[PDB]
Structure formats: C-alpha cells, structure tokens
C-alpha cells in the first residue's frame, strides 16, 4: 500500500478540533483522530470509506 498510509496521524499546528479518519497500520484499520484544521498530511480522510479505499 502507499507509504503515507503507514505514517502516524498528523494533528498539525492549528487548534481547531476536527475529527478525521486515518489508516492505523498497526491495527490494520481506519480510525479517528483529532485534526487541527490546517496543513494536513495524506493519511487524513473525511470518511472511513475513503480511508479504506485508499489505504486498505
């Protein structure tokens, strides 16, 4: 699978509280984390489906 899928979730420097999905390689599944609101990395999805399709 793509390399960015193996990277840990990146909250970013912004301080909003936005729930996003990321692929957790360790558990082999997509879960949620708190995204700050800016400068997102690729392992950041607005839905579980998009996450599973891209990183599954």
């Amino acid at each position: 699978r793509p390399d960015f899928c193996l990277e840990p979730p990146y909250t970013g420097p912004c301080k909003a509280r936005i729930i996003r999905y990321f692929y957790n390689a360790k558990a082999g599944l997509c879960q949620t984390f708190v995204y700050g609101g800016c400068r997102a990395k690729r392992n950041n999805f607005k839905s579980a489906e998009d996450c599973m399709r891209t990183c599954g």
């Binding site: 909250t11 301080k15 909003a16 509280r17 708190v34 700050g36 609101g37």
Partner: peptide, 8 residues
C-alpha cells in the same frame, strides 16, 4: 498554553 479545540 491553548490547544486543539481552543482555536478562534
């Protein structure tokens, strides 16, 4: 410090 959830 301020943190996630405090923005704005």
């Amino acid at each position: 410090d301020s943190c996630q959830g405090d923005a704005g």
